Tab-separated table of C-alpha atoms and ligand atoms in Angstrom:
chain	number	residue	atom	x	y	z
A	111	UNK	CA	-18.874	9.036	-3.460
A	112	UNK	CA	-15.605	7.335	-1.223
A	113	UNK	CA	-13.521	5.547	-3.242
A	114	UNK	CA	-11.336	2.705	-2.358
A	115	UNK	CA	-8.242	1.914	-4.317
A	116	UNK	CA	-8.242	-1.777	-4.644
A	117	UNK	CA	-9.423	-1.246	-8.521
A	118	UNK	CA	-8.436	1.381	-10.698
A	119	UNK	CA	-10.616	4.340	-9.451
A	120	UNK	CA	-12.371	4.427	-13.393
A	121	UNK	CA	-15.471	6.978	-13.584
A	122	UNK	CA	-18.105	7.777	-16.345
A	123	UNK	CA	-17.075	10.997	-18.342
A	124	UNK	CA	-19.065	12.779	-21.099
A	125	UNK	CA	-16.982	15.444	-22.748
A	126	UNK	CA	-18.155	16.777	-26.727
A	127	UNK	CA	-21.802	14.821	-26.493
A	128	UNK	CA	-19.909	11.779	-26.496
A	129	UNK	CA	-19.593	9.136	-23.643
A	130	UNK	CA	-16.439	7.350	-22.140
A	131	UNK	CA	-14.658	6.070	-18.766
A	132	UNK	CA	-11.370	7.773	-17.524
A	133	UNK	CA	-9.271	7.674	-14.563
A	134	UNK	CA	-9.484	10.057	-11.095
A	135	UNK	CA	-5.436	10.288	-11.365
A	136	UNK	CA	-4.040	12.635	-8.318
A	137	UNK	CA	-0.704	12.007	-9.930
A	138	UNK	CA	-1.775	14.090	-13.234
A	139	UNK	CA	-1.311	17.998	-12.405
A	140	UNK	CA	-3.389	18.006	-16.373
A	141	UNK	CA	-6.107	16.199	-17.881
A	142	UNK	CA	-5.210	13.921	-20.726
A	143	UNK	CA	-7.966	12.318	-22.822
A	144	UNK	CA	-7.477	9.842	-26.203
A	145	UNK	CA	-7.938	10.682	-29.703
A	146	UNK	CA	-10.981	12.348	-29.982
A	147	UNK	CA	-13.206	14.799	-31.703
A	148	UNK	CA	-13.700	18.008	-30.302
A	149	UNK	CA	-15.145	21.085	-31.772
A	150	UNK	CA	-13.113	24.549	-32.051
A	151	UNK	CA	-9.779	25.688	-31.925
A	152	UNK	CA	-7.033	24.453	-30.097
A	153	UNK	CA	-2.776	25.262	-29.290
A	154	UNK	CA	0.232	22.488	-29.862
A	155	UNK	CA	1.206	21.021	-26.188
A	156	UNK	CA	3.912	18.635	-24.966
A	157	UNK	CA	3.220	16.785	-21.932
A	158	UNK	CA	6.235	14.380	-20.364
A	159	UNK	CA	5.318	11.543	-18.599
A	160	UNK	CA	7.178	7.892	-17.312
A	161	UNK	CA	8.815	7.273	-20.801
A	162	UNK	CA	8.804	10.100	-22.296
A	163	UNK	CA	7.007	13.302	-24.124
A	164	UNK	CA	4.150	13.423	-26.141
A	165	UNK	CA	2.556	16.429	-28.610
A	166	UNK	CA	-0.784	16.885	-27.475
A	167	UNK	CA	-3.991	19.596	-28.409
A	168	UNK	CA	-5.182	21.807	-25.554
A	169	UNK	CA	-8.494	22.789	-25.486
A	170	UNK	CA	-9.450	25.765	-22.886
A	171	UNK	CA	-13.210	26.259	-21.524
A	172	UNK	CA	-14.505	22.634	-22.282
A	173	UNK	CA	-17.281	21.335	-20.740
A	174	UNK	CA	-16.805	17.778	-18.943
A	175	UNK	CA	-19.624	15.687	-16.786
A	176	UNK	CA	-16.977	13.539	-14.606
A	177	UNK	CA	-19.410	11.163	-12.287
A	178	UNK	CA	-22.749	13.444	-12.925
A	179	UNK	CA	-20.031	16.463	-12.164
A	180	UNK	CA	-20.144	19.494	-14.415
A	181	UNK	CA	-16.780	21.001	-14.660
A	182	UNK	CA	-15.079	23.453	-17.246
A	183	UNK	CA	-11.388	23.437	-17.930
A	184	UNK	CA	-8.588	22.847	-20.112
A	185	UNK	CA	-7.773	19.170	-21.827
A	186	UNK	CA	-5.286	17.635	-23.398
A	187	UNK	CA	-6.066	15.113	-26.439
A	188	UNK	CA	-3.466	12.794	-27.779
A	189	UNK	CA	-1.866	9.660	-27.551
A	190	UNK	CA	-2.075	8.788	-23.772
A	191	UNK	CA	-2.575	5.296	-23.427
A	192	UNK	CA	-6.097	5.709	-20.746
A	193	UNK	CA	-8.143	9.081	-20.714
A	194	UNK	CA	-6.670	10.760	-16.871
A	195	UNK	CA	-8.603	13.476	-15.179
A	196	UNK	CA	-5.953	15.515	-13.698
A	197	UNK	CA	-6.273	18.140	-10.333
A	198	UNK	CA	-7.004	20.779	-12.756
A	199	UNK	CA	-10.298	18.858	-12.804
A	200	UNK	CA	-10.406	16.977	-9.583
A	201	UNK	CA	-10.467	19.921	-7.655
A	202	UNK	CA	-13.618	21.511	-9.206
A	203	UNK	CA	-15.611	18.393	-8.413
A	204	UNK	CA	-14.532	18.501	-4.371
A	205	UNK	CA	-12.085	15.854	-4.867
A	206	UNK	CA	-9.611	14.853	-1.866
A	207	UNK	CA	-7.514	12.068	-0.884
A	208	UNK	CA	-7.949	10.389	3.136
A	209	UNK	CA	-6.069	8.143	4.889
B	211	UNK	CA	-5.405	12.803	7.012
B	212	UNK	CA	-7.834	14.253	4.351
B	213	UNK	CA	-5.306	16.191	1.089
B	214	UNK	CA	-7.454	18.740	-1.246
B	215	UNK	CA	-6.130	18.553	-4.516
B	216	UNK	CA	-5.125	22.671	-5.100
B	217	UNK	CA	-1.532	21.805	-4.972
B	218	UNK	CA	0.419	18.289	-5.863
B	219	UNK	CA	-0.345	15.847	-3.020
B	220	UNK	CA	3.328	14.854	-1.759
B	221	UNK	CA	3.991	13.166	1.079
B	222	UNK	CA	7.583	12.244	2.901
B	223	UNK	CA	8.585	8.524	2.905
B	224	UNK	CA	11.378	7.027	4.621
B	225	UNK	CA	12.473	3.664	2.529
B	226	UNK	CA	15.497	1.706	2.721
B	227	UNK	CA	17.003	4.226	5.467
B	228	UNK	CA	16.455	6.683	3.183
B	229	UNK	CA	14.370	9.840	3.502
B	230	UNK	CA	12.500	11.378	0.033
B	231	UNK	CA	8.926	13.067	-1.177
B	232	UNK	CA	6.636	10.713	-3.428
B	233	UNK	CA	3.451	11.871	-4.493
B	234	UNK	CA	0.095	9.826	-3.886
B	235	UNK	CA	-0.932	8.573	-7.609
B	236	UNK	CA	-4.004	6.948	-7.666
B	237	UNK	CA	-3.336	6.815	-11.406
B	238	UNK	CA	-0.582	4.428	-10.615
B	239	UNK	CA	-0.952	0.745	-10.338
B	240	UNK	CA	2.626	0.183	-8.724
B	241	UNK	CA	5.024	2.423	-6.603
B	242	UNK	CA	8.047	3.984	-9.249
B	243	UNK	CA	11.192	5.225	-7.395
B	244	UNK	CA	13.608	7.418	-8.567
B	245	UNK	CA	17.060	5.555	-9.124
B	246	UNK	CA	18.342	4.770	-4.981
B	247	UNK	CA	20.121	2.448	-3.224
B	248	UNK	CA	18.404	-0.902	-2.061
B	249	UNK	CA	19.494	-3.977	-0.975
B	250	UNK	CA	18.648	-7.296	-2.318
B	251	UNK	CA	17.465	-9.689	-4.855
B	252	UNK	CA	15.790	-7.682	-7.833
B	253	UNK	CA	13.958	-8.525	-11.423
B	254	UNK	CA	14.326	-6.497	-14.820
B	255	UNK	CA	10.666	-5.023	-14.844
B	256	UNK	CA	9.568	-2.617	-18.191
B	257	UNK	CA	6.490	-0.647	-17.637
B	258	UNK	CA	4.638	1.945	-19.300
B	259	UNK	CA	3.347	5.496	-19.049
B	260	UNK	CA	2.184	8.595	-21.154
B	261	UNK	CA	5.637	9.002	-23.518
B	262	UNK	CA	6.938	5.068	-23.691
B	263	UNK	CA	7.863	2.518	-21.406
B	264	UNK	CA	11.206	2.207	-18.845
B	265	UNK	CA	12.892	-0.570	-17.292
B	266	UNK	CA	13.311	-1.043	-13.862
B	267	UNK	CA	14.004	-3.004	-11.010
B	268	UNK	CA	11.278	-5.012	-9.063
B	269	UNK	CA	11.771	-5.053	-5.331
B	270	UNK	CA	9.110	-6.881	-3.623
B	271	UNK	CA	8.875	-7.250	0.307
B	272	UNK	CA	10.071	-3.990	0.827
B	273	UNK	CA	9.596	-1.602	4.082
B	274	UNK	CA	8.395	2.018	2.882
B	275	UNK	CA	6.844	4.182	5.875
B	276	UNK	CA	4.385	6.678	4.152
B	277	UNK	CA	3.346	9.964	5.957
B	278	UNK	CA	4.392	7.921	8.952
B	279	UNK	CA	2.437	4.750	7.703
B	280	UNK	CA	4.070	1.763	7.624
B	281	UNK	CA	3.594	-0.517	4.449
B	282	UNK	CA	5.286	-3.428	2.453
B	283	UNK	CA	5.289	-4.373	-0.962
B	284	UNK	CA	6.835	-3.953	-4.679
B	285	UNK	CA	8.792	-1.151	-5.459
B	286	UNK	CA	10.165	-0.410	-8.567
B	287	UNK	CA	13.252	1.740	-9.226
B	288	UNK	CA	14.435	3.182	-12.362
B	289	UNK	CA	14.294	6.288	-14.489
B	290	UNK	CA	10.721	7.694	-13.198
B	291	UNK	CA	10.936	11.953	-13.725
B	292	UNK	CA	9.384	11.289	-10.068
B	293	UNK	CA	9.059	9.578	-7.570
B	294	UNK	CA	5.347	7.715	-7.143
B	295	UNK	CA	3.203	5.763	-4.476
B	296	UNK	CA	0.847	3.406	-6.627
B	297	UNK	CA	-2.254	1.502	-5.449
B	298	UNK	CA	-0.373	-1.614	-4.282
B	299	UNK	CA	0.660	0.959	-1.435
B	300	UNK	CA	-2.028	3.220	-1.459
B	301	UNK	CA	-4.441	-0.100	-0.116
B	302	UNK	CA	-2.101	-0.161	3.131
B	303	UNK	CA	-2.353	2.903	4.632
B	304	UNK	CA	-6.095	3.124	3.886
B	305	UNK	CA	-5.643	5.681	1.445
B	306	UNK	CA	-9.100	6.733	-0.491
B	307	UNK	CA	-10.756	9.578	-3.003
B	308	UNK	CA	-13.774	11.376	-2.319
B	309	UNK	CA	-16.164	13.381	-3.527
C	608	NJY	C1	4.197	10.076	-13.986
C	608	NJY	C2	3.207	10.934	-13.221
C	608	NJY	C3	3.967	12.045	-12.541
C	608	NJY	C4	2.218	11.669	-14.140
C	608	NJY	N1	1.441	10.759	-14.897
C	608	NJY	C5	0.193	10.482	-14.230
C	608	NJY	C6	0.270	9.071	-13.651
C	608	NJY	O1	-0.828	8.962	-12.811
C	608	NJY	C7	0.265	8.031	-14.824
C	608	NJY	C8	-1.141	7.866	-15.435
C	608	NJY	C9	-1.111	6.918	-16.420
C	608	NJY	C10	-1.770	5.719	-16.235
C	608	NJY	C11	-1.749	4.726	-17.200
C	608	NJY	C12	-1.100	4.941	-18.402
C	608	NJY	C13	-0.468	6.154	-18.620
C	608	NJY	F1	0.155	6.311	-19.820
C	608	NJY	C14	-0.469	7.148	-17.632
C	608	NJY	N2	0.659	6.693	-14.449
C	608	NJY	C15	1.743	5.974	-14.749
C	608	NJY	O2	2.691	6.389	-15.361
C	608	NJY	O3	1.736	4.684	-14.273
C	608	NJY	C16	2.370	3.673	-14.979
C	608	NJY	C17	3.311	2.963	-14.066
C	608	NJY	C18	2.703	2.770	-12.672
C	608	NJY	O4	2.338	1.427	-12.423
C	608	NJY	C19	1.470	1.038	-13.477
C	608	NJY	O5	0.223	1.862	-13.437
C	608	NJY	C20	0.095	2.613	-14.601
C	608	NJY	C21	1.397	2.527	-15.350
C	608	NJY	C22	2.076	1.238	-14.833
C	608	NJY	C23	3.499	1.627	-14.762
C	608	NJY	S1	1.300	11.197	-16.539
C	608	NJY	O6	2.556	10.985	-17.166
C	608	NJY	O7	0.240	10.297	-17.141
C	608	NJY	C24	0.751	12.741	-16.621
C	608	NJY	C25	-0.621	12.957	-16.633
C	608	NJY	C26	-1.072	14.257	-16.690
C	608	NJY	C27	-0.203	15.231	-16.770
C	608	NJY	N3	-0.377	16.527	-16.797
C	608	NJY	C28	0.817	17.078	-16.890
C	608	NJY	N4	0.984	18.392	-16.972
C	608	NJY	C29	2.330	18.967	-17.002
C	608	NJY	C30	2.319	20.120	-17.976
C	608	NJY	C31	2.773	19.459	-15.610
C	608	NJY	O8	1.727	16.238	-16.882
C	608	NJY	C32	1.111	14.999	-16.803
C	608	NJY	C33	1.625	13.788	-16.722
C-alpha cells in the first residue's frame, strides 16, 4: 500500500502466534515491541530514546508478518510505550518514504 | 523524491535562518528540535518518548523549509538526542510510506 501521514501510519503485526498493531516508524533505526512472550533465548539491550534509556531483550531470527509481510530479524521487547517497526524491518518489506 | 530505508532518512532544513539535518519520523506526531535559537512567543510543552518524557518549548507558526519544501507549523525545541520532522510537517510537503 501508499500511506498518507495524516493518522499515525498503525499496521497489523503477528509476531510469536500472537496478534497486535504497531507503528511503520522511519525514525527507529531498531524494532521495539511491548512486553511480550516470546519463545527462546535472548541478550540484555539498552536502547536511548527522547527521555531517556531503557533495558530491553533482543531476540535475533524472529519471524514477524507486518501488513501480510513475512520478515525475519532482530526485536527488541521492553517497556516502549507503542510497539515501532524500525528500518531493520521496513526495509525487508520494500518500504520507502515519497514526497 | 522517493528515500529507501537502508540508511537513516535525513534530510537538510533551513529554520529560523538556520541551516541543520532532521530526520523524517513518521513515528513522530510533532517536529522535536535540538536546543536553537528562535524568536518569539513560546509555551512550556512536556512530551514523551521511549526512556521518559522532556520539556520543551512550543513554537507554533513557524517557517521550516524541508529538502527545499516549504512548511509551517509547531516546533518544539528542547533536549531531543536529535533532531526530528513529525507528521504535523510531514502532511505539508506531501510526504508518504509505501510498500
Ligand atoms: C527519537 C527517535 C530518534 C527514535 N525514536 C523513534 C521515534 O519514532 C519515536 C517513536 C515513539 C513513538 C511513540 C512513543 C515512543 F515512546 C516512541 N517517537 C517519539 O519519540 O515521539 C514522541 C515525540 C514526538 O511527538 C509525539 O509523537 C510521539 C511522541 C510525542 C513526542 S525511539 O526512541 O522510539 C527509538 C526507536 C527505535 C530505536 N532503535 C534504536 N536503536 C539504537 C540502538 C540505534 O534506537 C531507537 C530509538
Amino acid at each position: 500500500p501508499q500511506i498518507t501521514l495524516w493518522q499515525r501510519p498503525l499496521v497489523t503485526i503477528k509476531i510469536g502466534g500472537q496478534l497486535k498493531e504497531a507503528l511503520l516508524d522511519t525514525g527507529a533505526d531498531d524494532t521495539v515491541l511491548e512486553e511480550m512472550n516470546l519463545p527462546g533465548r535472548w541478550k540484555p539491550k539498552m536502547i536511548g530514546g527522547i527521555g531517556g534509556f531503557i533495558k530491553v531483550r533482543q531476540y535475533d531470527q524472529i519471524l514477524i508478518e507486518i501488513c501480510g509481510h513475512k520478515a525475519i530479524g532482530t526485536v527488541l521487547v521492553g517497556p516502549t510505550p507503542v510497539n515501532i517497526i524500525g528500518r531493520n524491518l521496513l526495509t525487508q518489506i520494500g518500504c520507502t518514504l515519497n514526497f
